[PDB]
Design a protein around this ligand. Sequence first.
Ligand code: HEC
Ligand code: HEC
Ligand code: HEC
Ligand code: HEC
Ligand code: HEC
Ligand code: HEC
Lengths: 232, 204, 16, 16, 181, 181
Amino acid sequence: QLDHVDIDLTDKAAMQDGARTFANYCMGCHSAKFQRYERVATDLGIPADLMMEKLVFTGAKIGDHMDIGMKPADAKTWFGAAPPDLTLVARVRGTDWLYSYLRSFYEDPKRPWGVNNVIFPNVGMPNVLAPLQGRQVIGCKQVQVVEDGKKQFDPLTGTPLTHEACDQLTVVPKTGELNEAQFDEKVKNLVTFLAYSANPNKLASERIGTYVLLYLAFFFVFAYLLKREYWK
Amino acid sequence: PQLDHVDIDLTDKAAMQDGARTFANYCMGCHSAKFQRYERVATDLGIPADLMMEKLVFTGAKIGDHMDIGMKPADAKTWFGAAPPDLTLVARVRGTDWLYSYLRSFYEDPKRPWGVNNVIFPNVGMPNVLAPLQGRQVIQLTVVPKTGELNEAQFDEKVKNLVTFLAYSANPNKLASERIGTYVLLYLAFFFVFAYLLKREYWK
Amino acid sequence: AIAKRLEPVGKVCVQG
Amino acid sequence: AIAKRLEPVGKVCVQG
Amino acid sequence: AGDAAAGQAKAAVCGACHGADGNSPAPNFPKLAGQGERYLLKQMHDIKDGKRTVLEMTGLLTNLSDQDLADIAAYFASQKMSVGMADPNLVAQGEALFRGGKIAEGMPACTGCHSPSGVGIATAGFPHLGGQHATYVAKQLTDFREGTRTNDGDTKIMQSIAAKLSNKDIAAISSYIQGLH
Amino acid sequence: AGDAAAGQAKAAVCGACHGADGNSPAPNFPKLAGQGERYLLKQMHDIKDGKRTVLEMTGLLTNLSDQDLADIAAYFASQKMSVGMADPNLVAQGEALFRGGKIAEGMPACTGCHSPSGVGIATAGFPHLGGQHATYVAKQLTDFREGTRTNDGDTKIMQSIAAKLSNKDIAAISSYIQGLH
Ligand code: HEC
Ligand code: HEC
Ligand code: HEC
Ligand code: HEC
Ligand code: HEC
Ligand code: HEC
């Protein structure tokens, strides 16, 4: 069961925060090698000097690909699985899968890195956002009561009516920098940046396609008239 | 410049083996032969694979690997002022006569960065790496007596074997090419007889 | 605004 | 024969 | 899991070298405060079993049971590692190495397994680094590079990583880590 | 050019450390016998001008003129470097590094600039290596790697090459060079 996330690719601030998160917490193991710092800065509206100073940690040039020092073979040996390139991961898995996966890490002592993932069971990835999210465990917490889709909210306060459930992801209190909403926004910005990286031509594609479709409707009108006429 | 002619025999397995030894020991330090594989060199030179690995593969590479070297072209270009080119095809780029005259034309030239110059290749960036064998050659080129392991004839034989190996490396298909071409031309003459007879019959 | 948004996570305390 | 023909130039003395 | 409350009492002997709260004052003694409990327990077990050789700890862990070690590790993990200061002449190179690694040499950045802030990953056993003494960090990197320390497992994560660090790189990155937070 | 006959008399003071014929008895002192005349003269001038720092040689070359240094270098070049022995446990690795370098790391084999037999290239100034004391060769490689020795020129030939040698690589290659001939 995945969680839906509404990703706004026109939000430059969110994409900038996601790029910062990717460059700091993700490019340690994951490359974005099919994507250049120059294009990322141009599309996110980041000044080239600012991109150089804030997001390029590897000594690469602005026009260089987002390569990292960790080789796939070395990382496969170290982690048991090679950390895949994340340029297209939004297209490979989808944004909802990424949103649910980056928020589904929970402590699991039986695992090599002490964590497991609801979305990606037995994943070889360490929980690298634990400092932000905090300790997440499979425990008992309050979950909204649902009966055959009959979802109960509080009529007055508008907040959910909840009952206790003991197989839920619960963040141990005062264990991470960000609360649930703040970590949700952090993961949303990161997944928004990954969605941009997978499909950097999306907005331009929509604009160009709108113009193309308008032209094709015009041309269709003319061709239809030239056909129906001349078929009399 | 005037080159010295050398008769290169690509059927001489012993000469090509000696040339391969010289190339692996004295030339692969700076030059790659990266477009040929140790396995194919062994097969064409009659060298057993184990013997090839023990005697000619110094880089730790596998028998089936290209004869690559550690010296990267950029580093070598910085160090010597010129990149040592890959020598797999040098016998085709320069010819065997040019190589034979070049490897024997190093003489001492203190004004040069490496203390040597070359008659065939003036102001070349190669150090005289075969000086231990030829000895001290000075300017007409003359070798200072009792300065090298080999005499003029022995060093000429060494350079000839090395150039023969280089010639094989540039064109490893030459012997098979001649063997196949002989049969192809025989078949084409055979087919020409029939085609000509058919044309003559029809054009009556 | 962008610079604050893009601040690197790792902070290093330096002499002087 | 071939083994002698291909002997590496560099010879190394080793203890014992 | 260990008990920090009892570990405090059990960790008094350690405080002689590592400090009462685990923030050692001397550079050669590592700070145990704020270090991952899993990593601390692994290191203590390795030193007990000789997988990691610490001559200054000869026989100190032999008489401590597994639960005592767990309690001490929990107590030290319940503290906060104090942050040192990086050398200004070295902070730039150390920061570049830590955050970016070496693309050309294929050396990973340290920010992946050890957080960008150097807190490590407690669950994964990746040690906290930020604030650790520069001398100790440099010694550990050198030991990994030369194979003196091999308790990082068969995968040889840190041995392989430190094989790609020069002495100047080790010094710079240790100085940067000393001030990292 | 220098005169070996006069150099022998001029080189007597050096023989205290490097041996009368240039084959030093102590590992820490390099052998000068059979070394390339150009390389010997370059090292002498670098030590004179401070381009190379040899504390044990402080002031020994200040009073020697260019002709005296040339004579000493010519005398030492006329000699034959003695050959030591390589450690059996290190000869394989050292031989591999010396003859093949490192393909993956891009480290050149030493057989190019230094002959396959280690005699160097006298005209080019590439030093004779074979038979040199393993301790001295290891120290030189370490200094090149650490930047302590920088008299190899602006191209930083040996600094760049030694940057890629580990301590174990340096030890093995030094042992092999000592045994090499
Ligand atoms: C930002 C903190 C990160 C995001 C977002 C992702 N990673 Fe990682 N990761 C790592 C490994 C060793 C693996 C492979 C695990 C396995 O194959 O079992 C992964 C995997 C992922 C995936 C799954 C992609 C897929 O197609 O299945 C995603 C979506 C992903 N990662 C996103 C290791 C590391 C790591 C080393 C400590 C770091 C710092 C990160 N991952 C960071 C992020
Ligand atoms: C490093 C010490 C070298 C070794 C050992 C050998 N060669 Fe070389 N070579 C070297 C350089 C730096 C250059 C370029 C010089 C320049 O000014 O461009 C060369 C060049 C050659 C060439 C010329 C090829 C061409 O110009 O197309 C040849 C034919 C050649 N080298 C052959 C050769 C042989 C046979 C060697 C072993 C006996 C050998 N080289 C060793 C550097 C070095
Ligand atoms: C001085 C006599 C010490 C006392 C008392 C204790 N330890 Fe210590 N320890 C000491 C040194 C000099 C070192 C560093 C070793 C090195 O390789 O440089 C250590 C190391 C540790 C570690 C590893 C820390 C890390 O990897 O981050 C641990 C986990 C540790 N020591 C634990 C520990 C405990 C539990 C002690 C009391 C039982 C204790 N130490 C005492 C020196 C000394
Ligand atoms: C002991 C007091 C020495 C005397 C007397 C001389 N030299 Fe020396 N030399 C000495 C040491 C310890 C070293 C090695 C320095 C290092 O970096 O490890 C050297 C080195 C040289 C060299 C370089 C040799 C090389 O292989 O690069 C040269 C050319 C040299 N020394 C020359 C030299 C001359 C001419 C001397 C008499 C005037 C002389 N040395 C005396 C120690 C000592
Ligand atoms: C991937 C996993 C990495 C990365 C990319 C780096 N390191 Fe770290 N490291 C890792 C592990 C699994 C361990 C534990 C080793 C063990 O269990 O014995 C370590 C440990 C260290 C240490 C020692 C810490 C201490 O003794 O307290 C240091 C100093 C260290 N690592 C440094 C370091 C640096 C400088 C890195 C980038 C060059 C780096 N690591 C990367 C795992 C991983
Ligand atoms: C080509 C450039 C090479 C390569 C492939 C190697 N070296 Fe050697 N080397 C070279 C030069 C030009 C010099 C002179 C340095 C100077 O002028 O100060 C040297 C010197 C050395 C030395 C010093 C020897 C001494 O002090 O007497 C050593 C020990 C040495 N080089 C070792 C060495 C090794 C182990 C190599 C392969 C890993 C190697 N070199 C390659 C030029 C070149």
